[PDB]
Design a protein around this ligand. Structure first.
Ligand SMILES: CCCCNC(=O)[C@@H](NC(=O)[C@H](C)C[C@H](O)[C@@H]1CSC/C=C/CSC[C@H](NC(=O)OC(C)(C)C)C(=O)N[C@@H](C)C(=O)N1)C(C)C
Length: 377
């Protein structure tokens, strides 16, 4: 029954992907950011300059007050609100209604985005990282417990003004080609995975693989960039600079500050390298790799002038909280969050990225010794 959920995601570039939801009785419609990097379901519940609508608990006859406050910080942005419960449905999801924990957002700082068209956030990770503590059941746990929806979902995020699919409860095989390759979920808090090798244009970065996972690696649809620990970021940028040294870029470009522009249709994709991330596989000493094209980590942005030139921002940034495989990494792959079997699957998406001579790819099997030493403790 998955055809009805195809294309149920929208968004603006670099502003997150959202799904339509309803809360309360009568149903109030809201666009909800899909975030696999957090575990709280929360909605704007008071006026805000950037909110065009918001949840009005007083208009819902099924609302229940939990009489408990909550604060949630993210990498960028934070909010505090009031906990309660209400009935929740997904118009272009499964045909069910669940009573779910909802945080009613009453104050926020740099959380809502001017012109993003979403008014809340759906944290899809596990209760261990829910606020204020792991006793606040996340939405997807509630959905699985109260209905017959199988315990998995998949995400097909498509680039450019953006759209995609969140298939709730299953895998839609018309949305990807080739084989699905699975990596274990190391621990059920974030969707934590283990990166065992990194290559740039086929050249091993030759770092202790622990550095790739310092202090964790996660899959996070709510983060735009590929985010890398300091040491990995520095070696990657050095390698990308060297491969593209044909041209010169402002130093702020490599920090994500300044953007780079070329005359329309002349972007020199060939001087930027592919990046291969090797992930721990399902059998002993076995891994697989996903290959990222520069069309993914050079994110297109609107020309800051009155020109018709293609402009891009560098969508790889430095992290202090581990590797984050954000939306630019997920774009062009079909990603299966198989919570029932504690694994994440990757395949080439049907909305894959087109280069004239290179192709994003998921490839295996590879042999990799001592993969367990790559996890940080
Ligand atoms: C200070 C962090 C404290 C720890 N908090 C967490 O780990 C929380 N989870 C998280 O923070 C997640 C890891 C991230 C989460 O998805 C949050 C969701 S905030 C709502 C996101 C909406 C979509 S816009 C994406 C944005 N793009 C962006 O900034 O673009 C430029 C870089 C080009 C300017 C971005 O990337 N945001 C990152 C930074 C981020 O904050 N993501 C919860 C578990 C409590």
């Amino acid at each position: 029954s998955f055809v009805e959920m195809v294309d149920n995601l929208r968004g603006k570039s670099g502003q997150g992907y959202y799904v339509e939801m309803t809360v309360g009785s009568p149903p109030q419609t809201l666009n909800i950011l899909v975030d696999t990097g957090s575990s709280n379901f929360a909605v704007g519940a008071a006026p805000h300059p950037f909110l065009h609508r918001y949840y009005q608990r007083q208009l819902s006859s099924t609302y229940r007050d939990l009489r408990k406050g909550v604060y949630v910080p993210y990498t960028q942005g934070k909010w505090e609100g009031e906990l309660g419960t209400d009935l929740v449905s997904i118009p272009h999801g499964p045909n069910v209604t669940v009573r779910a924990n909802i945080a009613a957002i009453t104050e926020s700082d740099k959380f809502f985005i001017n012109g993003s068209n979403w008014e809340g956030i759906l944290g899809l990770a596990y209760a261990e990282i829910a606020r204020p503590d792991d006793s606040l059941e996340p939405f997807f746990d509630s959905l699985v417990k109260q209905t017959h929806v199988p315990n998995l979902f998949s995400l097909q995020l498509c680039g450019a003004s953006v759209g995609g699919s969140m298939i709730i409860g299953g895998i839609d095989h018309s949305l990807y080609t080739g084989s699905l390759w699975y990596t274990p979920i190391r621990r059920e808090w974030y969707y934590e995975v283990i990166i065992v090798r990194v290559e740039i244009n086929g050249q091993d970065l030759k770092m202790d693989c622990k550095e790739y996972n310092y202090d964790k690696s996660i899959v996070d649809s709510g983060t735009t960039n590929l985010r890398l620990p300091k040491k990995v970021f520095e070696a990657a940028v050095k390698s990308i600079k060297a491969a593209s040294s044909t041209e010169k870029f402002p130093d702020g470009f490599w920090l994500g500050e300044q953007l780079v522009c070329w005359q329309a249709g002349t972007t020199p994709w060939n001087i930027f390298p592919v990046i291969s991330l090797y992930l721990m596989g399902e059998v002993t000493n076995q891994s697989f790799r996903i290959t990222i094209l520069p069309q993914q980590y050079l994110r297109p942005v609107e020309d800051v002038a009155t020109s018709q030139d293609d402009c891009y921002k560098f969508a790889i940034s430095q992290s202090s909280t581990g590797t984050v495989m954000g939306a630019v990494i997920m774009e062009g792959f079909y990603v299966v969050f198989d919570r029932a079997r504690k694994r994440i699957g990757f395949a080439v998406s049907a909305c894959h990225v087109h280069d004239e001579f290179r192709t994003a790819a998921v490839e295996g099997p590879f042999v990799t010794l001592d993969m367990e030493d790559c996890g940080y403790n």
